[PDB]
Every structure is written in C-alpha cells, then in structure tokens.
Design a protein around this ligand. Structure first.
Ligand code: 5GP
Ligand code: 5GP
Ligand SMILES: OC[C@H]1O[C@@](CO)(O[C@H]2O[C@H](CO)[C@@H](O)[C@H](O)[C@H]2O)[C@@H](O)[C@@H]1O
Ligand SMILES: OC[C@H]1O[C@@](CO)(O[C@H]2O[C@H](CO)[C@@H](O)[C@H](O)[C@H]2O)[C@@H](O)[C@@H]1O
Ligand SMILES: OC[C@H]1O[C@@](CO)(O[C@H]2O[C@H](CO)[C@@H](O)[C@H](O)[C@H]2O)[C@@H](O)[C@@H]1O
Ligand code: MG
Ligand code: MG
Lengths: 180, 201, 189, 180
C-alpha cells in the first residue's frame, strides 16, 4: 500500500508549493534585509515549509524552534500551552518571525505571539503556509500567507493524520475510509 | 581523597577535589539563622499563608533548585488545601543578568489561567528573574501572584519587587545552606550559614 | 467558570487515619540520613529527586545527611503503553549536570511496580554512573512488576492507597506533614 | 552585504544536493516499505536535510525531534548530553531512523544511538548528509551517507557559523575574514 492511494485529491501541488515559497522567500528577504531576525518554527508541523522557505530567503537570519503541549481546556480557550522546549536564545530586542504550517483558531499562536511581546521582542510577524480565517477564535492576522484554505482537514507538507503523512511533498485531502 | 566534575554555565566544566575528612561545618564561619529559628519562622508563615489562602486552592510553585528545602518545610506547616508545581529555568547569559529573561527548561504541569499563584523562593536580591516570572504568570492570566521568600536582600534590587512574605532580611554576608549553594555544595545544611571567605577566594 | 467551596473544611477531616505520623517520619529520616552520610563518606554524590512527590522527603532526608553532596531533579511523563509495561518515560526535565563517573542517589516517595524507577536506574548506568542507589520513604514490594530492591527504605507499607508528605490524591494533600489514609467518602473518581 | 559574499567556495551545490536527496529518499522508501519507522531529527542542523529527504521518501513514516545541550567535558569525551526535548512517543519496538547534518566525532550521535537501543528500539539506523570519518572519536558508521567530506569547517543547508548561514541552499566554505 502506498500513500497516494490514501489521498482523494491533491489540493495544492508540489509545483504550486515550490513557486509560492520562492515568492514568499524573496519578499521576506527584502523585508528583513537590514537586521538578522530570529526565525522560529513550532514543532512539528512547520518544519518542512520552514526549511524550504528559509532556503529561498537570501538574507542573514538565525533559526530556532519551540515545542509546546496542551493543558487541556485553557489551551482550548486562551491558547496557553506548556512550553516543552523554549528558544535557545533571548527574545528581547530581536525581530521575530514565526513560521507556521496552518492557522485555524489562531489561539495558541496568538498566545505565543503575545508571549514574545511580553519578552520584549522588537517586532513579531507571522508567515504561514496555509491560513483558514473562517476558523478564528481570536483576532490574529498573518503577515505573510501562502494559501487561504476553506477547511483544515488536509494532510501533507507538514500536516499529519495520526502522525503520518507529514512527509508528502504536496497538500492533499484523505479519502474518507482512512479516518472513518 | 575524592573528586568529580559537574556542569557550570559560566565557564563549561568545574572539577571538584575533596579531602576524605573535610566536613561542611568547618567551612562555616558562623551560623546566621539556626534550624530552630527557621522552624519557628516557617510555622508562623505557614499559619499566616493558610489564613490568607483559606478560600482558594492556590498553586504553590518552587523555582528549582534552591527553594526546595524551604518550600517543603513551609508547605507542611501550611494547613490548607493547595497544589504544588515546579519550574526550572536557565540563564541566556549577559541578557539574563540585565533583564531577568530566562530559558524555561521545565514549565508548570498545569495552566496558570485563573489560578492564585504562590511562588516560593530561597532568596531575592536583584529580583530581575523572579520579576520576569511574576509578570509571565500575569501574562498567563493568573488570578493573583504572590511571593514568599526565606531570605530577602531588598537593597540589592535592580527592579521593583516587594515579596509578600519574607522569612529573614539578610545583610552583607554571603550565605549558604537550606537550599542555597556555593559551587553546588551546602544546599543540604539544615541552617543558613556564613561561609568562610577562604572557601570562596 | 470554576467555583470552589472549602467552607471551613480541613484536610484532617478527610483522613480516616494517620498511618505514619510526623514524629515517626522524622525519626526514620534522621536514622537514614546518618547511615547515608556514613556510606557516602568518601564521595560527593548527586542526589536526585523525581518530581513531584519525592520533594518533602528529599528536603528532610538531605538536611539530616551531613556530608558533601549535590542536589538535582528530574521530571518525567508517561508514554502510555511502554511505560505501563517497560517503564520507559518521556524526560521533561533532565539533570543539570552529567552522570558519568558520579555516584547517583535517587530519592523517591514510594516504589510500587518499580517499572519507571528501574528504567531510570539503568538509564543512569547507561550514562556511566560510578554507582546508582535508591532511597525511598515508602516501599510496597508486593506490587512489583520488575525485580528492584531499594538500597534504603523508610517504611514498608501494605498495598493500600495513601496520601501526604509529597503523595497526592488529585494533586491535593502533598503538604500534609504525615502519611494518612483517606476516608472512603472522599474519593470520587 | 549578501551571504554569498562571505562564501569563498561552494563545495556542494543545491543541484548536487537535490539529486543526492532524491537517491537517498528512494533507497530509504524501499528499505522501510513494510513498517512505519520513527524518523528523528536532532535540532537544529538536521532540519533542512530531514525536510527535503523525507519529502522524497515515498513511504509511511512518523517524524519526531530531539533537542539536546552540552554538559561540558562529559559531552566532549563520552557524547552524553542533556535532553532538552525528548521524543513525543516511545522508542520501544520502533525502527528508528536518525537524520543528521554532519557526523564528525560521532560522540553525541553514538550516545543517542545507544540510548535508543537502551530504550529497546527494534533497530537504529542513521542517514547523514555529510560524513567526516577522519574525525571520529568512536566507531560509528552511518547507514546512509550523502557526501563524504575531509573537514567540518563548512556552512549552509543546516550547518551554521555563529547560528547564521543555516538557510543557504548549498554547502560552502567561509572566507577567512568571516571568522577572523
Ligand atoms: N548562595 C547565595 N546566593 C546568593 C546570595 N545572595 C544572592 N544570591 C544569589 O542570587 C540568586 C537569586 O537572586 P536574584 O536573581 O534575585 O539576584 C540566588 O540564586 C542566589 O544564589 C547569598 O548570600 N548566598
Ligand atoms: N498518592 C499515592 N501515589 C502512589 C501510591 N502508590 C503508588 N503511587 C504512585 O506510583 C509511583 C510509584 O509507582 P511505580 O512506578 O513504582 O509502580 C509513586 O511515585 C506514586 O506516584 C499511593 O499509595 N499513594
Ligand atoms: O482550493 C483553492 C481555492 O482557493 C481560491 C479561493 O479562495 O484561491 C484563494 O486563495 C489564493 C491564495 O492567495 C488567492 O490567490 C485567491 O485569490 C483566493 O481566491 C481559489 O483559487 C480556489 O478555488
Ligand atoms: O506578619 C508577620 C510575618 O511578616 C514577616 C514578613 O513577611 O516579617 C515582618 O513582620 C515581623 C513582625 O511582625 C517583623 O519582625 C519583620 O522584620 C517583618 O519583615 C514574616 O517574617 C513574618 O512571619
Ligand atoms: O565535495 C565532494 C568531495 O567528496 C569526495 C571525497 O571527499 O567524494 C565523496 O563524494 C562522492 C559523491 O557523492 C561520494 O560518492 C564518495 O563516497 C565521497 O568520497 C571527493 O571526490 C570530492 O572532492
Ligand atoms: Mg535575577
Ligand atoms: Mg512505574
């Protein structure tokens, strides 16, 4: 059994992903040409996009990562999450760029954004591969967006179903029998 | 003789060499706060805190490693329903020294939102790091954040931070014992002592 | 959203009986501290407590151990299948120094199945500890799922659920200065 | 004022890397066709290679990451490191595939490999982008290797100099003036 056999439809092809990442990287490269920002990804979903985005971003930058976990309901309410791994370097006075795979409710990411401002970040911006604005549970707008999607039930290029499918080179929708 | 090495985040290794009959007490010039004084103080503070937190189940949090002995003795003299949690942090270097911002190595196991937080500490001096943690808990929407410290050096402050409860105000002496260390040793003393100058240079 | 009612409720009202009183605990902690101090005369051990329950006992025991030593702490969490059957746990907070060449003394609240503790002991051996020993306040050896004998033990207890002195029931009671048994009416799961 | 200006010479081009990654991905997809392994990346340097390698690995897999920090001398002489972020799932009985940017001394990686075997891993294999066997301080052989290199003084594609240059899409050598 092969993975493509579980995909009902490719919603965004690899070619489309590659073209958009080239575009976003040039845009971000120009916006931060002056000062080296701290590019941060939240594990695990953001990893593939961050890697390709940053490699298409011709400007000095530092990479870092955080890992967090849910606290149950305060996470599904305020976005507060337990920090499992904090950044390797200080946030104060740095220009932060959060690299995300998808923004739906926006809760956890909003929490992290305002955490970085509490930590006195010079600025905080977000670049997300996919955005789902109809999902918002807080007011949070991404500064850079690859693709605006109608729903979050997709897999690939970082997105998983039961921890699998993150490795697909495109973004697709699963066949119903896979999850039901 | 005996020796070992440990990690030190301001070097990053220290090698420690001990003589077979060296004893902690001989390194102490004088006892500053005896165990008996400490027992009496935690008894008094615990009854006070038990009264102040009578209507709520607070989350008492200790900042590892130094707060552990005081937190254990204080909480067992605090006769009220409460939960315990712990945090571990790491310095970012010159930037922690000047802002208080630290790396979270171990975050709380439960959420801060809507909780009455009681932070238990061993000593407050510059107050930078503790202040960072207090306002972190407020950013996390705690209902209230209070601090109880065994020792306070309030004129050493680099930020405004008044502890809600303090065991003893300490003057001009470098102390160890009851959680406080010198190169990771002495934390296990049951009293607070003044370390002989020859030990630290 | 959350409302709390304690009224003038006190924890003692929830305790059917005090199993090990504060006085009993302090006398045994003092004896243990003296034995450990003697056993560890010739070395500076790394005493490690496993959060959260071991803390009250660790504080009192080390205060009664008159010998040079370093303290450290670890935090761990379950994986759910391999933990239940092999003791493997996720490390949430590792030690702040290396284990290589150290004499490790693991301070514990109670040992029941001993699966996680066994995992940690052998982890420390893999990390090249010079020695690994265990001191536990309580021991429930009838409950074992692996062969693991503590090197130092305070009290052997039956296979019954207890609280106090670090031990909790739904995150409460850790602050009691004794080990007690809850009234049946108290535990609604 | 651009990163390329700090690069004395491209050792391994983006094109050479993309071609090698395609070849490794196919080999790995084939070797692990029967069971979904746990693909683990050690932050931070392994991230770009891991993302592009797995993307070219057409088989079911789960991704995970670890974060580690030095303890000082013990790290330097035994590879023992402080775990800052452990795996999100258990190792017992899983086939582990560690993805690395470079293996030089091999000390820490050997430590993590034998840690996974202590954790009862069904098997542990390593895929590295770069290999420098002349630099070994323990006998550790990668199962899969992108390129063998004489020395480790290189940047790009995850490899850094003072936390910068990780985002270059190729592997290069810095000009002397960059590190004085
Ligand atoms: N051991 C010891 N530490 C001190 C003393 N005075 C200040 N400190 C250090 O100051 C640290 C926290 O103080 P702050 O970050 O508020 O300045 C403590 O960890 C403590 O080690 C002292 O007299 N003895
Ligand atoms: N509160 C409480 N916890 C217990 C009791 N017995 C076992 N435990 C829990 O189980 C752990 C030891 O279980 P083991 O891993 O040895 O099977 C203890 O650290 C504690 O968390 C008990 O009687 N009371
Ligand atoms: O399934 C893709 C679907 O999305 C659309 C409409 O939302 O494209 C949207 O997102 C693009 C990404 O920026 C925009 O360029 C476009 O303007 C916007 O409509 C459709 O193209 C398509 O049906
Ligand atoms: O309320 C008593 C309580 O206050 C503390 C500070 O938290 O000490 C203050 O009050 C004492 C007398 O009431 C003074 O002697 C002391 O100098 C002052 O700081 C605690 O130590 C005490 O438990
Ligand atoms: O920069 C390439 C460099 O590597 C060498 C040896 O250092 O050859 C390596 O690369 C080959 C191409 O993948 C490998 O097949 C081979 O195993 C490895 O030795 C040199 O030829 C070259 O200068
Ligand atoms: Mg400070
Ligand atoms: Mg167990």
């Amino acid at each position: 059994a092969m993975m493509n056999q579980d995909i009902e439809k490719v919603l965004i092809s690899e070619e489309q992903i590659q073209e958009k990442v080239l575009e976003l990287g040039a845009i971000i490269a120009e916006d931060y040409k002056n000062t080296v920002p701290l590019a941060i990804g939240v594990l695990k979903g953001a990893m593939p996009f961050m890697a390709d985005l940053l490699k298409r971003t011709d400007t000095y930058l530092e990479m870092d990562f955080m890992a967090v976990s849910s606290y149950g309901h305060s996470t599904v309410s305020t976005g507060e999450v337990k920090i499992l791994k904090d950044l390797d370097t200080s946030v104060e006075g740095r220009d932060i760029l959060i690299v995300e795979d998808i923004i739906d409710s926006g809760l956890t990411l909003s929490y992290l954004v305002d955490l970085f401002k509490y930590r006195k970040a010079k600025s905080v911006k977000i670049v997300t591969l996919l955005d789902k604005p109809t999902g918002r549970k807080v007011d949070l707008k991404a500064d850079y967006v690859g693709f605006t999607v109608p729903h979050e039930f997709v897999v690939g290029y970082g997105l998983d179903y039961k921890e699998q499918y993150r490795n697909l080179p495109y973004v697709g929708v699963l066949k119903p029998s896979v999850y039901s």
